[PDB]
Design a protein around this ligand. Structure first.
Ligand SMILES: CC(C)n1cnc(-c2ccc(F)cc2)c1-c1nc(C(=O)Nc2ccc(N3CCN(C)CC3)cc2)c[nH]1
Ligand SMILES: [Mg+2]
Length: 301
């Protein structure tokens, strides 16, 4: 796990920045086009500062090792633009371009800001397959949310942004860093803010998945109205958030119930959530026509 950012080549005459599509923890993410081929790629540009140096090395290594997986946006390589001595250099991280954008963007471009149970089931399983791969390699994402779940032109689900992700040595290993997006953060993660003896593990990603499912169902996560600091206080003490409507199937209500167990000890693991009827029983690996058509309607207008 040794990266040198000196032997990296200049991106001039290879990739160019077309438009800004989003941002990722540290950096601004662009739609990059290859100068010759016209091949599209997601490119995160960020200043190589001493404060965010080891956190960028962490990301690259994690992407080099695990991004091959079909449910993780594939890392191609890195370039660097040299600013004059004393100034910070621009690091370019090139990656698979997810043409349809984020789950959050699909929600906003759907009637009543609510997705079908069958899309939520499909996406939730693809996220679980991505998380299962990561957790098996002692990885915690620690920032699972609609914004970090992207879709390709083929409506293939991809996890992105390993900027606040943890690499563990031992299987039973634990973390204590208060990090993530407040609305999606698990209670045992939020505990670490004030309590210095509090520790968490991979289970925290399965809570965030639970909130991401509610995000897809209702259009936004629980406590999205109030201030993040006003939300961080209630998550640990309030009862597990549920779906407002009862029109949702009993199996989908059961999946949110399984995901959002506040006590991480009683919470099911990744492999257990895969066997849950909501994940196991779906109409799969061919029939995603509705999604591919839904994003084609967005392309026109
Ligand atoms: C931003 C995301 C949270 N992110 C954080 N960090 C990295 C990243 C990028 C490159 C690397 F090498 C490493 C990390 C990434 C990352 N966004 C992508 C990506 O493809 N994003 C994308 C593409 C298209 C859209 N459109 C919006 C408008 N219309 C509806 C059409 C679609 C929106 C967003 C791929 N990776
Ligand atoms: Mg991949």
């Amino acid at each position: 796990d040794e990266i040198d950012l000196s032997a990296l080549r200049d991106p001039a005459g290879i990739f160019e920045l077309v438009e800004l599509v989003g941002n990722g923890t540290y950096g601004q993410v662009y739609k990059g086009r290859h100068v010759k081929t016209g091949q599209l790629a997601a490119i995160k540009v960020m200043d190589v500062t001493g404060d965010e140096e080891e956190e960028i090395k962490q990301e690259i290594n994690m992407l080099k090792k695990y991004s091959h997986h079909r449910n993780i946006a594939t890392y191609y390589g890195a370039f660097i633009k040299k600013n004059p001595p004393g100034m910070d250099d621009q690091l370019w991280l090139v990656m698979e371009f997810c043409g349809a954008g984020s789950v959050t963007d699909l929600i906003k471009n759907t009637k009543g800001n609510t997705l079908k149970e069958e899309w939520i089931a499909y996406i939730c399983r693809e996220i679980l397959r991505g998380l299962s791969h990561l957790h098996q390699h002692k990885v915690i994402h620690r920032d699972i949310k609609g914004q970090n779940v992207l879709l390709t032109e083929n409506a293939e689900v991809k996890l992105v942004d390993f900027g606040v992700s943890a690499q563990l040595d031992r299987t039973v290993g634990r973390r204590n860093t208060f990090i993530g997006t407040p609305y999606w953060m698990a209670p045992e993660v939020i505990a670490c803010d004030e309590n210095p003896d509090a520790t968490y593990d991979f289970k925290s990603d399965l809570w965030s998945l639970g909130i991401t499912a509610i995000e897809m169902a209702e259009g936004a996560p629980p406590l999205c109205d109030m201030h993040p600091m006003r939300a961080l206080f209630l998550i640990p003490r309030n009862p597990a958030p549920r779906l407002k409507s009862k029109k949702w199937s009993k199996k989908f209500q059961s999946f949110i119930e399984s995901c959002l167990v506040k006590n991480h000890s009683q919470r099911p693991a990744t492999e257990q959530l895969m066997k849950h009827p909501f994940i196991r029983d779906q109409p799969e690996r061919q029939v995603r026509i509705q999604l591919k058509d839904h994003i084609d309607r967005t392309k026109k207008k």
